[PDB]
Each structure stands twice: as C-alpha cells, then as structure tokens.
Symmetry: D2
Subunit: 245 residues, 4 copies
Amino acid sequence: SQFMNLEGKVALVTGASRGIGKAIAELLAERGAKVIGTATSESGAQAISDYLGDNGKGMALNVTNPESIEAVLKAITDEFGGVDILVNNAGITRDNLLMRMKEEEWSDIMETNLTSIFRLSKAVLRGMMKKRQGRIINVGSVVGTMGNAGQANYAAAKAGVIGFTKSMAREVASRGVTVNTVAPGFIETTKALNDEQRTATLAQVPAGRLGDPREIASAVAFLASPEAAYITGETLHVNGGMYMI
Amino acid sequence: SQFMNLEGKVALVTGASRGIGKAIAELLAERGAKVIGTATSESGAQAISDYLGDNGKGMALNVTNPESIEAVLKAITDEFGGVDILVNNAGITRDNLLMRMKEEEWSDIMETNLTSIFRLSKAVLRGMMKKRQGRIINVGSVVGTMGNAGQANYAAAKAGVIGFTKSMAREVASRGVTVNTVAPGFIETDMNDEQRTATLAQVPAGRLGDPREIASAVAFLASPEAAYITGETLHVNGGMYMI
Amino acid sequence: SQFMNLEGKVALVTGASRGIGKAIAELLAERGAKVIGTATSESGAQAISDYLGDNGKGMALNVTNPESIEAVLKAITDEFGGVDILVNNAGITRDNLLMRMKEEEWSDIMETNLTSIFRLSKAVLRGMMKKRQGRIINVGSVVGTMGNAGQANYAAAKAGVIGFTKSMAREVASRGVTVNTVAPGFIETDMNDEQRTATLAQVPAGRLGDPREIASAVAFLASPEAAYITGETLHVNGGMYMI
Amino acid sequence: SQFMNLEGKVALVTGASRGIGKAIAELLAERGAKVIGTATSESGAQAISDYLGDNGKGMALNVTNPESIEAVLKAITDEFGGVDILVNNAGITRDNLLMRMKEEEWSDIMETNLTSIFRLSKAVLRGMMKKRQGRIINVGSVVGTMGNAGQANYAAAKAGVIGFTKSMAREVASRGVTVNTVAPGFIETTKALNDEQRTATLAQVPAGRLGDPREIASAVAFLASPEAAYITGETLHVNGGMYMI
Ligand SMILES: NC(=O)C1=CN([C@@H]2O[C@H](COP(=O)(O)OP(=O)(O)OC[C@H]3O[C@@H](n4cnc5c(N)ncnc54)[C@H](OP(=O)(O)O)[C@@H]3O)[C@@H](O)[C@H]2O)C=CC1
Ligand SMILES: NC(=O)C1=CN([C@@H]2O[C@H](COP(=O)(O)OP(=O)(O)OC[C@H]3O[C@@H](n4cnc5c(N)ncnc54)[C@H](OP(=O)(O)O)[C@@H]3O)[C@@H](O)[C@H]2O)C=CC1
Ligand SMILES: NC(=O)C1=CN([C@@H]2O[C@H](COP(=O)(O)OP(=O)(O)OC[C@H]3O[C@@H](n4cnc5c(N)ncnc54)[C@H](OP(=O)(O)O)[C@@H]3O)[C@@H](O)[C@H]2O)C=CC1
Ligand SMILES: NC(=O)C1=CN([C@@H]2O[C@H](COP(=O)(O)OP(=O)(O)OC[C@H]3O[C@@H](n4cnc5c(N)ncnc54)[C@H](OP(=O)(O)O)[C@@H]3O)[C@@H](O)[C@H]2O)C=CC1
C-alpha cells in the first residue's frame, strides 16, 4: 500500500549486523527503503549484504572515526544519492559502579554512544535540509530516562542523546526534517544473562517478558514514515511498562 | 501485508463523525479492523455508517451516559463480539480563565474528557483481559503535558487521562492488554486568524498537524507490532513540546 | 533570619489535623506565617487550634462543599485578610482494581482530590493577583506521575492536579503568583506488613519519608526565595521515581 | 535555627567566582557550611577567599584536569576533612548551529560540562558513602530538558548530567547520599545580550523576567539541607515557567 511506505528513501542503519539494528534494517527494506547497514568489519558488512540482497547493502563503519564516516557517506551518496533516513543504532556498554569505573570506560561510552550521533547527524543533515525532507532516529535506552546503577556512563550518553535530539529537532523542524529517539527497554538479544538476573529484570517489567527486536524495528519504521512527519523532538518508549513518562 | 494488520479486530472509536475521530476510524478500517464509530446524534451515526460501508457502522453514543454506553457495547458485542481496540477520542473544550470559569465548564470537561475514559475502559476491559489481548488508546492533548492559559479544566482532564492510563497499564500488562495515550498538538480541525499565527508561532514545524497524522499514530499503537508499548504518551505536535 | 521567612503571610492548609498537613501547618507557622489549618469536624478544628496556639487557628472545612469553602474564606478574610499561601493537602484514597471500582469511588476521588483544587484555587486567586503576590502549592503523589495498579482513580486525580497547576502557572505568572505541586512518595502516615516491605522494595532510600520532609519542600516553595519556580512538580520520594 | 542548617558540613562549589556559583557559595556559608569555592586562576581563588572570609576559602581548579582535581580535594580533605556537599556548577557554552559546530566546540562542552561531573563525583563519593551522608547537586539548565537551537552540544551535556544523576542516585541512595540537579532558566548574569535577544527570550518566560542568581542559590541550599534527604534523582526547575515537566 501507500501506508508506511519508504519506497524512494535511502536509509543508513549503523550497527546492523545483529539484534535490533538488523531487525531495523530488515523492516525498513520490507517497507521499501534502500538500506545501507553497517558493521565494524568487512566480514560483518558482507553478512549484512547477504541478508539485504537487492534491497541494499553492507559497509564497514567505525562511528568514532571521522574518516570512516566520510568514506561511507560518499560511497552511499555516489551510488544511492543522499541519505533520507539516519538510524543511529551503533552503541556499547562499559558497565561498572562509579568507584570502579575507568576513565576509558567513561570516555569510550561518550565517544561511541553520544559523540557519534553528533558526527553522523551533522554529516547527513545538509542534504536532508536542502531536500526539505529527512528523518534522524536515535536508538536510546530506558536507562537514559530511568537511570540504572552500574550504568552511569551509559545512562549519561543515552540521556545526552535526547538533549541533542530535542535541540536538533528545534533547529531543523521548519525545513521538514524530524529528529527523534526510540528508547527500548529490555529486549531479547540479554540472552546468556544469569537465570537470576533475568527474573530480577523481568520482575520490573509489567508485560512480564522481554521485548522482541522486531518491536523496536516497528517503532523505528513508524517514525521513519511520511505519516510520522508531525512527530519531532520525541522519545518513544518501548519497554513493556518498565518505565512510564 | 501482515504488517500493521488489524483484520479480525473489533475497534470502537468514540466521536468518529468528524476530524481526528473520523480519520482514526477510516485508517483502522483501511488496516482491516471492523470499526464502530460513534456520534452524539443518529444523523451523525448514519454519516459514520455511510463512510465505513462494509467495514463497520455508526452508533449514537453520549460518553457521559452509563445507559448509552451499555446499550452501545451490548449492540456491538451481540453483532461483532467483544471490543479489541478502544479509542477514546470523544472530547470537548470549555475555555475560560479561572476567574471566569463556571462550575459547569469545569464539570462538563471532567465528565466528557476524563470520567468517560474510566467508564468506557472499565466496560471493555474484562473481555480484553479474558482474551489476553487488547488495546486501549486515549486521545489526549499536548495541553495535558504543557498546560495552557485559559484551559485549566481541559489540561486537568487531559493530564488525568495519563495518570489513569499509566495505572491501567500496570494493572493489565501481564494479561496482554496495552493502554496508551496519543497526545496531538494543534491539528487542523473544527477548532481567530490572530490566534492561529500566535499558536503556529510556537510550532517549530511551522504548520498545524493533519488529522491523518493523529490517525497514523493511533493505528500504530493499535497494531500487534506495538505490543511492548504501554503506559506511554506519544506526542504528535510538530515540536511544540518535547518531553 | 530573613531567609525563608513567611512573617506577614496568611497560609491556608487544608486537611491539617494529622500527618502531612499537620507537619506543613507547623512548619509554615515556625517560619512566621499566620496559619489556618482545616479538618472535616469541629473537634478536628479545635485540635488544630490547640497546636497552632497564637500562630493561627483551626476551622472546619469540607473541600467538596462550595458553601463550606465560602464560609471558611470569608471568616479568614474578615479576621486575617486575604490568603497569601494556599496549600491544597486534603485528599483521600478509594483503592480498587478497575473491574471492582465503584462509580462513587471514582467520583469521590475526582471531587476530593481534583475538583477541590479548582474550587479553592479559584476562591483565593483574585486577591493574590491583585496583590501581585501569591503561592498555590498542591500536594500530589508519586502515583500521579508513576501510575499504580489498584489506584487508577487516585492516579488520574493526582495527574490532573499537575495539568491544572501548569495551566494556572501560565495564567498567573505575570502577576507574581506561583503555582506548583509537591509530589510525595511513600510517607509514614496513617495509610499490611507485607505490602510495606513490597513498597519499600521499590524505594532506593530504603525507608518511608517523614511528613516533615514533605513540609520542608512546601515551606520552600512557599518562600519569597522560590519566586522563580512555577508550573513545577517537586518529587520527594526517596528515588522511587525519577523524572 | 536548626531549619536548613549546614553547620558542620563541608561544601565544594566549582566555578564560584561569579554569578550563580558565587551566590551558591555565599548562601551555603550563610546557612553554616564551611565552603570551598573554585576558580580557574589563583587571582580568582583569592577573590573567592575575600568574599567567604572565615566561612571558607578559594582554590584554583580546572575541572577537566585529573591532577588539579586530586590536588584540590587532598587540600580540602587535609584542612577541613571530607566533602559533604558537592556543587558541580562550573560549565561553559560553545554555541553554534550543527553545520557550523566544530569538533572542539563539541568535545570541550562534553569535557567541561559532563565528564567533569563523573570525575568530581567519583572523587568525593567514597567518603560520603562511608559517612552514610552526602549531597551531590549539579547545576544543569532548562536547555537540557527543553532543547535549544544553536546549543545541541550544551543540551546534550546538560541532558547527560541528568542521566548520570539518576544512575548515581540509584547507586548510592541506600547509603544516605542524594544526587540531584538544579536546572536554571534564564538568569541575570545574559547581560549585554542584545536588547532584541532578551525580549525574545523573555517573551518565552511567563514570569516576564530573568531569574536572580540568588534564586538558583536558594534551590541548591534547599537540596543541600538535611530536610532534603528524601529527594534524590530529581531535576528541580527554576525557570519562571519557561518549561513545565
Ligand atoms: N539490548 C538491549 O536490551 C538494549 C539495547 N539498547 C541499545 O540498542 C542498540 C543496539 O542494541 P543491541 O541490538 O543490543 O546491540 P548489539 O551489540 O547486538 O549490536 C551492536 C552493533 O553495533 C556495532 N558497533 C559497536 N561499536 C561500534 C563502533 N565503534 N562503530 C560502529 N559500529 C559499532 C556492532 O558492529 P559489529 O557487528 O562489527 O560488532 C554491531 O553491529 C544500542 O544503541 C544499544 O545501546 C537499548 C536498550 C536496551
Ligand atoms: N483539535 C485539536 O488540535 C486537538 C484535539 N484534541 C482532542 O482530540 C479529540 C477529538 O478532537 P477533534 O477531532 O478536534 O474534535 P471535534 O469537535 O472536531 O469532534 C468531536 C467528536 O467528539 C464527539 N463528542 C463530543 N461530545 C461527545 C459526547 N458527550 N459523547 C460522545 N461523543 C461526543 C463529537 O460528536 P458530534 O459530531 O455528534 O458532536 C465529535 O464526533 C478530543 O478529545 C480533543 O480534546 C487533542 C489535541 C488537540
Ligand atoms: N501518605 C502518603 O504516602 C501520601 C500522601 N499523599 C497525599 O497527601 C495528602 C495528605 O495525605 P495524608 O497526610 O497521608 O492524609 P491523612 O488521611 O493522614 O489525612 C488527611 C487529611 O485530609 C483531610 N480530609 C480528608 N477528606 C477531606 C475533605 N473532604 N475535606 C476536607 N478535608 C479532608 C483530613 O481531615 P480529618 O482529619 O477531619 O479526616 C485530614 O486532615 C493527600 O492529598 C494524599 O493523597 C501524597 C503522596 C502519598
Ligand atoms: N546563565 C544562565 O542563564 C544559565 C546558566 N547555566 C549554568 O549555570 C552554571 C553557572 O552559570 P553562570 O553563573 O552563568 O556561569 P559564569 O560564566 O558566570 O561562571 C563560570 C564559572 O565556571 C568556571 N569555569 C569555567 N571553565 C572551567 C573549568 N574548565 N574548570 C573549572 N572551572 C571552570 C569559571 O572560572 P573563572 O572564574 O576562572 O572563569 C567561573 O567561576 C553553569 O553550569 C551554566 O551552564 C544554567 C542555566 C542558564
């Protein structure tokens, strides 16, 4: 149908080799987008190419590296034209209580989960602004809003993603670009967590289950759609009731 | 496709004769739902029947009247079985600065915009809970979260809708029912040239939203795909407010 | 000192016979305010007069009764002049899961916990606006923001208090009146051994709050120092929720 | 009185040489605290010593420098014992629209306004946790929550401060330490802004005026008080109605 249809749009999804990023890439391609997913290695990029088939391709990207970012965008732009939908999914955890938290575990989180969104967003935004159409969608976390002990660095980065999102949303709203965050709760990815730890996390989820990566993909696809043009500066929580704002 | 597919679901959309409620009803029917839309008059109900065709029908409903609510649900339940998706859209404004605000302008807002959601939600929830599947989606307002001068009654009701939503979401999450709010900004609907520019001035998007844009957000939350969203307020306001 | 000094201010604290309302009344009187606390009975009013001594007095008030409200304000206004600080503390619970929730348990909550704030606020606001100085401070609840299963009515009312607060804050900010909400978590007050540990389990602080801790937050917002805070919800809940 | 009394508490207030940080330092000293305020130079430190008199002193601190931080805390700890109240006030702006925003304007904001709070908080928290009593109060900004065009970096840092605050609040609540943010709106400091720009900002303030630095000091003093023990993980907005959460 013409409902939630991304035909003619070019989507870049960072960290698309597995889990949530993969589900996002697959669903955007199902809705008609031409999708470039990224991994940190060529092997990972190839596997992304393998699952996207004629609907897009894989490329190697380190989101902390300016020259990598430039190489990937020029390659995309040459072949596909300018990016219409940016999904900043790539991210990491470096968990520790503050008294144990290393300088590098702080800085690596800031770099990968926050500074990267500044860099990538800045590198796609000019085209979007010229076309008067764009989507920037960040994958945040319930922890960004809720906080979590042992994840102060992660929480800071994810919270900063929202502050950036709101500010960019104000900056570019008049030129037809939206900027938003999807904040997952606990999603099956998480596996191999102790039996003890899962039940304890699950105990805080009214839904009484982990979310599926597809459920995060669906929310992203929605915000990426033409139908979602009047949503901007928003944080959409998909966490089974774990937190309610 | 199977994507955002509501075939087999029965949807009740209150206040579906025009604007946002109409757009909601049309979109849910387009995605496959069997839709009952309501108006406050039989004429209104007929027009709703006219635009839904074989995808549903219209019925007369006053959401402040227990006996009307009971009559409508029994009629729906007899013909279509139990409601799968409840869209509480019906609502009104009774604007005034507090010093000018009449007892009835307060109470009519509380009754129409808030107590109604308690009544209707309670009247569909048992079936949903038995089937272990349900959607309750409330149409709120940016004013519920932002506040607005001259709309304290409206803001109170719309804010109370969220408190109710969050509490019902906790209550029914383990039995597969989601409860959520969609909060529109300023949408081109029935409700000065001067006042519009002044409102628009607070919208970064630099336009009013279209009713279809509110419909799209509701359809999304109504979908099987939106099962892990509950207790949420989804803001569709062009950047007018950002939480 | 001149720090957090309420000398010369007239404070009305509804539901001041015990718990949080009592602690509020005592603290505002300690900071220099002339305090009228209320209870629902004359016996309760007398006890309030007993603990306030020369710093204020007690009066009987039912916040759901227009004529009671009018009688109390005229009496205050005659004796003490117009109210400078309004603390809307009076409130109740009528807990039940939605499927068990009676029409009266809904309506009694709406009336006592929400409509009352419209009535009382409207009845003090004109004077405050004329003097270009005022404080309206509502006692909400973490449940207003968090939701709680079995308390959908309460949550709706307490959430609606915020919508009202934000709208009134916009309406009266230019005339020097602030309107705010203090949202307690679980506080040691009248309201199982099992249920307490379960509630405590959700409090990082690992204890219930003291009524005095809610009093302190109210006194702060009531102060001249808090003039640039308005439309705010100040959460005092030991980490139970974090917005 | 015993109401809002900080006698016996040691307070460290970063960036206390002027405006909000100065007003904070003065008010905490008025309520009985022993106050160490900091500036980036010895001259600035001396002026802080001059206004605090016998109620505290000034020290030179660069909050982006680990060795500076260590030197200041050891000096405080030697003389006054361990810090009871930490006020992270030091911060900067590096304003620009994203397309003009330099790598350094991003990174300098992250370093000064966010990473600094990780470093300083970590360096005081052990003592607080051992004593089972502490206050960490961050000076954020309405922009952290509201977003602002031309301030995406600032907004990201200030938003990240909240994510960090919430997480630290969960981590240390059981050991009697609170962690909170005070978020000022537009405060008279701001001066020498165009006549045009002020009216435009003021137009968004229902209160119809800028806030006074003292009004931010009062909120901080409140949260620093024993009376505020049951407030943690909170963001207290003092913005004249400019934004309402
Ligand atoms: N899992 C959960 O419960 C939750 C997840 N989070 C967020 O969801 C997003 C994805 O989550 P999840 O599916 O669990 O993550 P995964 O670890 O499954 O996927 C990680 C992806 O990120 C890429 N990546 C890591 N570092 C870099 C880098 N420096 N440059 C470029 N790419 C990099 C990886 O590439 P490669 O394949 O080469 O390793 C990989 O494709 C993240 O932003 C995460 O913070 C959100 C809520 C909770
Ligand atoms: N317009 C906007 O910008 C915004 C809309 N709001 C909310 O969206 C919802 C719909 O708004 P909008 O489409 O603009 O409203 P309209 O006035 O355009 O339509 C209102 C609908 O509700 C029905 N209705 C009114 N009172 C009752 C009642 N007592 N019982 C049953 N039905 C009733 C009306 O039926 P009939 O045709 O018979 O009168 C009509 O179908 C409302 O809840 C409103 O508060 C939310 C954000 C802002
Ligand atoms: N306890 C808690 O943990 C929390 C408290 N809440 C809120 O704080 C407020 C006070 O709570 P708490 O001190 O625990 O309550 P209590 O039941 O301990 O005291 C209630 C007070 O309100 C008065 N009151 C009750 N109904 C009316 C009425 N219809 N008209 C006038 N006064 C009335 C009572 O008077 P009388 O003595 O004559 O009955 C009493 O003085 C309430 O709004 C409550 O919802 C907020 C967060 C949680
Ligand atoms: N002004 C406003 O309207 C608003 C202010 N903000 C926030 O309030 C806080 C203070 O604001 P304001 O009073 O305007 O700030 P000022 O610029 O008046 O004060 C700046 C202070 O921070 C210190 N500082 C700057 N960089 C460093 C550094 N690297 N290491 C240590 N100290 C440093 C300065 O030291 P030195 O004296 O040596 O220069 C100075 O003492 C900041 O966090 C700011 O972001 C919050 C809301 C809006």
